[PDB]
Amino acid sequence: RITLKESGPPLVKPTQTLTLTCSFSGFSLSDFGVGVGWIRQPPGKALEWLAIIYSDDDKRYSPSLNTRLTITKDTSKNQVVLVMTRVSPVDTATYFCAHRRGPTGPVNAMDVWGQGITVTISSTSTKGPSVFPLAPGTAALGCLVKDYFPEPVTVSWNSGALTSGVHTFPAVLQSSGLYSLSSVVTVPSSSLGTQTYTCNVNHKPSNTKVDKRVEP
Amino acid sequence: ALQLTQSPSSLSASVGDRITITCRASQGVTSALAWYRQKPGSPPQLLIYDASSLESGVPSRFSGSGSGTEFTLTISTLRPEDFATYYCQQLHFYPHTFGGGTRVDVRRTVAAPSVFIFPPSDEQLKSGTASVVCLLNNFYPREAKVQWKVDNALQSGNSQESVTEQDSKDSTYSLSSTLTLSKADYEKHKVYECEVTHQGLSSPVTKSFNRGE
Amino acid sequence: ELDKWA
């Protein structure tokens, strides 16, 4: 039926402007009522309403983001554009654009959403990770994959041969603009002296491969 | 603006369970209230529009009621695909507002975490910084508190954590906290302890190490 | 202000 989609830059630097585009098809902005809004959602946090624009141009913004947002619509392309200025790391989130019906009672909801595009703010250039050990019956051991950019990084243990006991945690964007994530595997003691544990790290975005062995 | 208080904020249920979640409005929004289900990694999905109307294509198990300031979303029989986060949104006043979301995870017996603390490495310790991490492995429920202490001074504003998603087999969670000190600060303190507070523990449990020893 | 179709 109706499908919408977000385009734009996944990486954006503090201060600059973030221009997002909503390309849709299944309706048009010529249909009476029809609205297209922008909803953003930080990491692991709630949905936040950004702005809405309708078939005839009235637009409403978020009182909090009002002086920083500008919404427009090109009806020849069936696109809606959103410009957010002077961004900071707190603007890092996933941005969604959704469709709103028009009067035919049921214009009370946003029935179809884009799939979302996750934007990340970071005055930072590409950078490979440094791999440190997190080392010692149940026993834990792991790898601290620190200071890399941008996502993602892939971690496996013993070249994939070890999969159970493993927990690769979500990376965190540090105050430095760089990422950091830990991967831990839980084994049972006894093997700590006969078994061997190596985490294979691969940050494709910077071509960095590291095999790290961990022990007491 | 218009505040929407969702509650519970987090819920724990099983399949075939029947749960009712509410969404409270600070001001009367008539019936301009929508409900969405959101599975991790996927966008919100409309379930109920106009407060009580079931959105075409949505299972009949979902339903909504309310008007003005009180609204609910009920799931007659909980399915595997329902363990997600739910949000309500009102479209009566500008700005359009969302609630804080309600979380529905899989219920299992309380499981206390297995705590491990990892000191920084000598290799890291010469880049100029010391990362000490605490691991809270396989617990339930999700709620856990981690406090860092260096020579007993409670640490604040220099740690970061991330939790994994609920395991699809043992339904537990695992957390990872990283205290970041600068090498110099790391070396003028002795006890590095990680204190975990969790429903499966009668008293908080601490894991510590003495830098040098 | 009120939503637009209120």
Same domain, yes or no, for A110 and A169? no
Chain length of chain A: 216
Residues of A in contact with B138 (CB under 8 A): 186
Same domain, yes or no, for B99 and B140? no
- Cα–Cα dist A114/A93, whole Å: 14
- How far away is chain B from the Cα of A39, in angstroms, using its nearest Cα? 10
Picking from A117, A172, A119, A168, the residue whose alpha carbon sits closest to that of residue A148 is A172
Size of interface A-B (CB pairs under 8 A): 129
Given a contact cutoff of 8 angstroms between Cβ atoms, the answer to whether B52 and B65 are in contact is yes
Same domain, yes or no, for B205 and B175? yes
Contacts with B102 (C-beta within 8 Å, 6 or more apart), sequence order: B6, B7, B8, B9, B10, B11, B21, B85, B86, B87
Same domain, yes or no, for A85 and A1? yes
Same domain, yes or no, for B92 and B33? yes
Q: Which of B65, B83, B107 is where one domain is finished?
A: B107
Three-class DSSP category at A192: helix
Across the interface, whether the CB atoms of B43 and A49 are under 8 A apart is answered no
Same domain, yes or no, for A72 and A49? yes
Residue B66 β-bridge partners: B71
Same domain, yes or no, for B80 and B122? no
Which residues 27-66 of chain B have a CB within 8 Å of chain C? Answer: 30, 32
Same domain, yes or no, for A129 and A66? no
Tokens for B151, please give them.
């020579």
Contacts with B35 (C-beta within 8 Å, 6 or more apart), sequence order: B23, B46, B47, B48, B62, B64, B73, B86, B87, B88
Contacts with A195 (C-beta within 8 Å, 6 or more apart), sequence order: A187
Same domain, yes or no, for B59 and B74? yes
Same domain, yes or no, for B8 and B79? yes
All chains having 3 or more CB pairs closer than 8 angstroms to chain B: A, C
* Backbone angles phi and psi of B80, in degrees to 5: -55, -40
- Cα–Cα dist B135/A140, whole Å: 8
Given a contact cutoff of 8 angstroms between Cβ atoms, the answer to whether A122 and A65 are in contact is no
Q: The domain that contains A76 carries what CATH number? A: 2.60.40.10
Q: Which of B56, B84, B107 is where one domain is finished?
A: B107
Size of interface B-C (CB pairs under 8 A): 15
Same domain, yes or no, for A119 and A130? no
For residue A204, give the DSSP letter: G
The total of structural domains in chain A comes to 2
Same domain, yes or no, for B67 and B115? no
- Cα–Cα dist A165/A189, whole Å: 13
- Cα–Cα dist A111/A106, whole Å: 9
Q: Which of A123, A144, A166 is where one domain is finished?
A: A123
For B20, how many CA atoms within 13 A lie in the half-sphere containing its CB?
7
DSSP string over A118-179: EEEE-S---BPPEEEEE----EEEEEEEEEEBSS--EEEEGGGTB-TTEEEPPPEE-TTS-E
Domain assignment of residue B86, given as a range: 1-107
Same domain, yes or no, for B206 and B156? yes
Given a contact cutoff of 8 angstroms between Cβ atoms, the answer to whether B26 and B40 are in contact is no
Q: The domain that contains B55 carries what CATH number? A: 2.60.40.10
- Cα–Cα dist A59/A36, whole Å: 10
Same domain, yes or no, for A46 and A78? yes
Tell me, yes or no, if B67 comes closer than 8 A to chain A by beta carbon: no
- How far away is chain B from the Cα of A91, in angstroms, using its nearest Cα? 18
Could you give the C-alpha distances from A141 to A1, A5, A185, in angstroms and in order?
Answer: 50, 42, 6
All chains having 3 or more CB pairs closer than 8 angstroms to chain A: B, C
Domain assignment of residue A46, given as a range: 1-123
| Data resolution in angstroms | 3.3
Q: Which of B107, B132, B163 is where one domain is finished?
A: B107
Residue B41 β-bridge partners: none
Same domain, yes or no, for B114 and B138? yes
Same domain, yes or no, for B99 and B125? no
Residues of C in contact with B30 (CB under 8 A): 6
Given a contact cutoff of 8 angstroms between Cβ atoms, the answer to whether B35 and B64 are in contact is yes
The total of structural domains in chain B comes to 2
Given a contact cutoff of 8 angstroms between Cβ atoms, the answer to whether B163 and B134 are in contact is no
Radius of gyration of chain B (CA): 22
Residue of B nearest to A94 (CA): B43
